[PDB]
């Protein structure tokens, strides 16, 4: 039973998310197993990577959007591999993922971040946290907060097998508004979270109280999203020149 659930979820996570912590850690603070990642510091360094692998601020806001959309797609697939998720009322499947995805994104986004910058363009780019701070208001306020959260989260030293279980727990969350059969999700979560604990205890014997520390971050992610959601409406209304891929505009409507 739970023997498979953890591993089935992990397989699903490996199958659907091409960037994972292991791939990203290698590329970050790695050597050049073939090629190291192209670094983006000055605006010169941005442009010289806009035909290589792809205003100045709006090019960034648009590029962010693109990978968000890919990830929502990977997340909807990941979700359909979580045991029992397929069987939920389609309406509920949709509610769970609407509120779910950007929590799941910011958790998984931590995996490509270190204190100095983040991997982009599937691991071929590395855009410096300092350059992102540099941007004209309010584009500078996009990534920094996700960095702050990442450094605390990366501090827990999770492996992809942990992260998979957590993202599932994030998705199957019966306190989202508008759910019909709340019960069938709460049971689904209990199982995922039980396994998450059991998994953390056997896989991180060093840090036995990792499970509680992790779960208190489900709250910080909710916050981080809300703060993101405001800052997005403000960029949507600041620049008529930088609008929002309809999927993202749909996950955002009334959140």
């Amino acid at each position: 039973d739970l023997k498979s659930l953890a591993k089935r979820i992990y397989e699903a996570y490996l199958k659907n998310f091409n960037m994972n912590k292991v791939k990203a850690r290698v590329i970050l603070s790695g050597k050049a197993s073939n090629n190291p990642p192209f670094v983006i510091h000055d605006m010169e360094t941005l442009c010289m990577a806009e035909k290589t692998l792809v205003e100045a601020e709006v090019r960034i806001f648009h590029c962010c959007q693109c990978t968000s959309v890919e990830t929502v797609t990977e997340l909807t697939e990941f979700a359909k591999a979580i045991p029992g998720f397929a069987n939920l009322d389609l309406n509920d499947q949709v509610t769970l993922l609407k509120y779910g995805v950007y929590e799941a994104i910011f958790a998984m986004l931590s995996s490509v971040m270190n204190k100095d910058g983040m991997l982009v363009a599937y691991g071929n780019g590395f855009i410096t946290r300092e350059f992102l701070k540099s941007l004209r208001k309010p584009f500078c306020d996009i990534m920094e907060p996700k960095f702050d959260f990442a450094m605390k989260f990366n501090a827990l030293e999770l492996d992809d097998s942990d992260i998979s279980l957590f993202v599932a727990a994030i998705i199957c969350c019966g306190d989202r508004p508008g759910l019909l059969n709340v019960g069938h999700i709460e049971k689904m979560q209990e199982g995922i979270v039980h396994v998450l604990r059991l998994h953390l205890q056997s896989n991180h014997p060093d840090d036995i109280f990792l499970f509680p520390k992790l779960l208190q971050k489900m709250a910080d992610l909710r916050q981080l999203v809300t703060e993101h959601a405001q800052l997005v409406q403000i960029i949507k209304k600041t620049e008529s020149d930088a609008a929002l891929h309809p999927l993202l505009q749909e996950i955002y409507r009334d959140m």
């Binding site: 929502v72 797609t73 909807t76 949709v94 996950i251």
Partner: peptide, 10 residues
């Protein structure tokens, strides 16, 4: 509502 999510989850 959510036209696109409905589409990705069928």
């Amino acid at each position: 509502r959510h036209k696109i999510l409905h589409r990705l989850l069928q």
